[PDB]
Design a protein around this ligand. Structure first.
Ligand SMILES: COc1ccc(C[C@@H]2NC(=O)/C=C\C[C@@H]([C@H](C)[C@H]3O[C@@H]3c3ccccc3)OC(=O)[C@H](CC(C)C)OC(=O)C(C)(C)CNC2=O)cc1Cl
Ligand SMILES: Nc1nc2c(ncn2[C@@H]2O[C@H](COP(=O)(O)OP(=O)(O)OP(=O)(O)O)[C@@H](O)[C@H]2O)c(=O)[nH]1
Ligand SMILES: Nc1nc2c(ncn2[C@@H]2O[C@H](COP(=O)(O)OP(=O)(O)O)[C@@H](O)[C@H]2O)c(=O)[nH]1
Lengths: 436, 430
């Protein structure tokens, strides 16, 4: 009874979406030929899985998402991958030439000649909706397509739909899988023009995902199928709230309300704990108290920043299977050991919990195996300023001697944009640092 | 007297006032089916104050219940005495009333003020003369604070003459899930000071404090505290409901009580503190009532009056009682506490006596004071508001919903000026 639309931009976005949509199939029992025996095959739905699949009279359960790429190299792969028959006759978006690591080329030159088609597609999809909450866009700060076009898309959407919210999932690109060197300019130039049209954005750092996969997954060569699968698992876990059924954090509005205090501070940090290694059959057993104890370890968060230096806003949680709220209360009492915990004086505290009575789903033939309990703490820390400071150092270095600047100026951008965005990010990091 | 129209707002209002209707309806001995059970005329001397005849000359309560969260109708029609009301004023919203002002204050609710004025005028047509109004609400959430202030202003426009009284519940950190309360409370009392005639500060902080530190209940629920407030506000209404020697009325209560032109916040109290009992009770007698009437842990505001002064006083005693004895102890209490009371109005501590016992207790009373201690409560609320406000917080919700920063600033200016007024009248001399 509340529709939802997602959208994928860029190679990273489309790959993550590929890795996520089949997880989404698995979770509800949806299968490329599945039928979910409790339905009428004609709109049989309006449950929490209706928000994505707008199932047709053919009992197909077609989704609500489109994929964007300036030059077909991954969107084709999903067009001829595994769930081929799962998408409409050329509903997807294919271009002819990428922005090539150039924020400007996607922000002023190329996208400004393809965007109208994207908006037409988004509107045409939304018309079939009835109660849309907002958009969930997938992009990255690395390239110029998944960044310049994303910011331009933000502007266009906020122009056409300002009332509705639109949650974001982003990647803070790492030197380890750095496919460019002009990422930091794109990152600043995207965060600066994101705030005024953003509401709540999640960053998942490929530094962090790479570290997790290399360390606790026994993989030394993280292709774009390993890190991609891990991130898909995290995204499914976070959106399970609205996805499976009703509990804490039903709606995107509710995301904002219980997460974001201050519209300049809307980058929640997500932690996880169950990192099942591999097909390893037997290591030991597991306890809910154990995983909630682990969800405080700095090594197990989706973005590298040590929060024992700062204060939290609102530390929500989710769980899968084996309800035991008394154990949860004991867990809060234990973590109250105040060795690495804090809250903020002005507003009281709430560790809202919502339980899903389904054990977590796993990739069948992947680098994981099925477990029974799961949990994901979305702690809106003040420590998330570490990432911005780290990226500011590099942006300042590169802008010291005006490196690469021509590749942006000579395409429809001015010189003052760089300076003003740097100042704006300085104000933003000041706005984080002052809270306390 | 003339008739009274009762107005009920939100979940808190609906629950508290439904329990209050139950309490008095038992007190006036009326059956759920509208059947008549009372055994004397002294019960129905002032039944016309609230209840109106049916086609079968069957007396029916006159009240209105307002909210926007459509799940409250079934809560109304599922109480013990819930179906008592007329099936014409169960008018509610249909899409929730999330605790945001200017949603029920500006955005919507302002579209149904026509509906609520229509219903209130419709049932005051059957009212031969109008006395005043009874708005029950709380200071947190739209349905509740915002609708209450909007209704107050609207009926003040339409009926500038008659009296306007209301019950205020101030949410507290001690029992409160949401946290957007202090903004609601201050935004409310700003309208409330300048737009109503008298108001009762039915607090939650003091309520929880005493219930947990003496009554020692594990989980203060919407059941227990509803019972407490319904009982106390029934005790307040008794004086009008009963025929008394201090034969006070709403206009008379205002004239006697109201000291300044902006200080009309009362502190309803109760001497024989009562939990959910079964038998008759453990016995209580006169001097116990005398002492527990004006104790430090029996009111509904977390303040010690000995740190302040009373502008006025009032009481309404219950049960078969020695009037001369009562006057003797009251004379002593006004004699042995010379500094406790203001020197501006001698012969302020008024007293009345009632006859029908409370339906469950033998000898009780009802304290309705007007102190200078209420500055502690107001200062508390304003300080927590400004702590939430020095840095913005969710304030984007309000600004995008219709207000500006100036309204917040002026609400704080008004509250701190009010606290200054109470401080000033608290430090007079001779
Ligand atoms: C610093 O970050 C923090 C984050 C959260 C917390 C505690 C966190 N916070 C709040 O939201 C409290 C007030 C903000 C208001 C805001 C200011 C009103 O405009 C709201 C509104 C309502 C409807 C539509 C549009 C707008 O929202 C709400 O009351 C909503 C109700 C609705 C969404 C069902 O949610 C809740 O009532 C909750 C989430 C069940 C109550 N509980 C909480 O544990 C503390 C901190 Cl410190
Ligand atoms: N899918 C995926 N992408 C990643 C990962 N790590 C980094 N990337 C990013 O993938 C991006 C490639 O897509 P884009 O950023 O859109 O590249 P572009 O040059 O703008 O355009 P295309 O190459 O046509 O997509 C780079 O910016 C990388 O930073 C990862 O683990 N998975
Ligand atoms: N329901 C109820 N709420 C109370 C009571 N006493 C205090 N409250 C507080 O009043 C607030 C409820 O506001 P409400 O009227 O529900 O706002 P609404 O959501 O706009 O209807 C909460 O902060 C409660 O803690 C009571 O006896 N009953």
């Amino acid at each position: 009874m509340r529709e939802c639309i997602s959208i994928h931009v860029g190679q990273a976005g489309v790959q993550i979406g590929n890795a996520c949509w089949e997880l989404y199939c698995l979770e509800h029992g949806i299968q490329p030929d599945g039928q979910m025996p409790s339905d009428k095959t004609i709109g049989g739905g309006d449950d929490s899985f209706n928000t994505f699949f707008s199932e047709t009279g053919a009992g197909k359960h077609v989704p609500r998402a489109v994929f964007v790429d300036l030059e077909p190299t991954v969107i084709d792969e999903v067009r001829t991958g595994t769930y081929r028959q799962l998408f409409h006759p050329e509903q997807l978006i294919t271009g002819k030439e990428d922005a090539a690591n150039n924020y400007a080329r996607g922000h002023y030159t190329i996208g400004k000649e393809i965007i109208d088609l994207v908006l037409d597609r988004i509107r045409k999809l939304a018309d079939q909706c009835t109660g849309l909450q907002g958009f969930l866009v997938f992009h990255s700060f690395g390239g110029g397509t998944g960044s310049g076009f994303t910011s331009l898309l933000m502007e266009r959407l906020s122009v056409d739909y300002g009332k509705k919210s639109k949650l974001e999932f982003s990647i803070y690109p790492a030197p380890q899988v750095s496919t460019a060197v002009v990422e930091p300019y794109n990152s600043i130039l995207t965060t600066h023009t994101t705030l005024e049209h953003s509401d709540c954005a999640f960053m998942v750092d490929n530094e962090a995902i790479y570290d997790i996969c290399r360390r606790n997954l026994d993989i030394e060569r993280p292709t774009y199928t390993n890190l991609n699968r891990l991130i898909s698992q995290i995204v499914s876990s976070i959106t399970a709230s609205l996805r499976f059924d009703g509990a804490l954090n039903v709606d995107l509005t509710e995301f904002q309300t219980n997460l974001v205090p201050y519209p300049r501070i809307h980058f929640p940090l997500a932690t996880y704990a169950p990192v099942i290694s591999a097909e390893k059959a037997y290591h030991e057993q597991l306890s809910v108290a154990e995983i909630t104890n682990a969800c405080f370890e700095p090594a197990n968060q989706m973005v590298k920043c040590d929060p024992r230096h700062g204060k939290y806003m609102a530390c929500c949680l989710l769980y899968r299977g084996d309800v035991v709220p008394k154990d949860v209360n004991a867990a809060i009492a234990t973590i109250k050991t105040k060795r690495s915990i804090q809250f903020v004086d002005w507003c009281p505290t709430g560790f809202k919990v919502g339980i899903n009575y389904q054990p977590p789903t796993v990739v069948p033939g992947g680098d994981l195996a099925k477990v029974q309990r799961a949990v994901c703490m979305l702690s809106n820390t003040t420590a998330i300023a570490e990432a911005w400071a780290r990226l500011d150092h590099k942006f300042d270095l590169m802008y010291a001697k005006r490196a690469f600047v021509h590749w942006y100026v000579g395409e429809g951008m001015e010189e003052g944009e760089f300076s003003e965005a740097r100042e704006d990010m300085a104000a933003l990091e000041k706005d984080y640092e002052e809270v306390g | 007297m003339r008739e009274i129209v009762h107005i009920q707002a939100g979940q808190c209002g609906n629950q508290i006032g439904a329990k209050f209707w139950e309490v008095i309806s038992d007190e006036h001995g009326i059956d759920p089916s509208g059947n008549y059970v009372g055994d004397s005329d002294l019960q129905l001397e002032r039944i016309s104050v609230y209840y109106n005849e049916a086609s079968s000359h069957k007396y029916v309560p006159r009240a209105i219940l307002v909210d926007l969260e459509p799940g409250t109708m079934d809560s109304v029609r599922s109480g013990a005495f819930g179906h008592l009301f007329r099936p014409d004023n169960f008018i509610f919203g249909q899409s929730g009333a999330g605790n945001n002002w200017a949603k029920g204050h500006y955005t919507e609710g302002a579209e149904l003020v026509d509906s609520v004025l229509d219903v209130v005028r419709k049932e005051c047509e059957n009212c031969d003369c109008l006395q005043g109004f009874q708005l029950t609400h709380s200071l947190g959430g739209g349905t509740g604070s915002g609708m209450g202030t909007l209704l107050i202003s609207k009926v003040r426009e339409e009926y500038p003459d008659r009296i306007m009284n209301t019950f205020s519940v101030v949410p507290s950190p001690k029992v409160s899930d949401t946290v957007v309360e202090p903004y609601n409370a201050t935004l409310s009392i700003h309208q409330l000071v300048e737009n109503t005639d008298e108001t009762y500060c039915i607090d939650n902080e003091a309520l929880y404090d005493i219930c947990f530190r003496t009554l020692k209940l594990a989980t203060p629920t919407y059941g227990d505290l509803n019972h407490l407030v319904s009982a106390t506000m029934s005790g307040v209404t008794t004086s009008l409901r009963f025929p008394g020697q201090l034969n006070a009325d709403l206009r008379k209560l205002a004239v006697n009580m109201v000291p300044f032109p902006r200080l009309h916040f009362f502190m309803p109290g109760f001497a024989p503190l009562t939990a959910r009992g079964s038998q008759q009770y453990r016995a209580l007698t006169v001097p116990e009532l005398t002492q527990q009437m004006f104790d430090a842990k029996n009111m509904m505001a977390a303040c010690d009056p000995r740190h302040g002064r009373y502008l006025t006083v009032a009481t309404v005693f219950r049960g078969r009682m020695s009037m001369k004895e009562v006057d003797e102890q009251m004379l002593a209490i006004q004699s042995k506490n010379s500094s406790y009371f203001v020197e501006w109005i001698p012969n302020n501590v008024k007293v009345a006596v009632c006859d029908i016992p409370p339906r469950g207790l033998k000898m009780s009373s009802t304290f309705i004071g007007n102190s200078t201690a209420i500055q502690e409560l107001f200062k508390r609320i304003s300080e927590q508001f400004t702590a939430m406000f020095r840095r913005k917080a969710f304030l984007h919700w309000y600004t995008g919903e219709g207000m500006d920063e100036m309204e917040f600033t002026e609400a704080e200016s008004n509250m701190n000026d009010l606290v200054s007024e109470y401080q000033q009248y608290q430090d007079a001399t001779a």
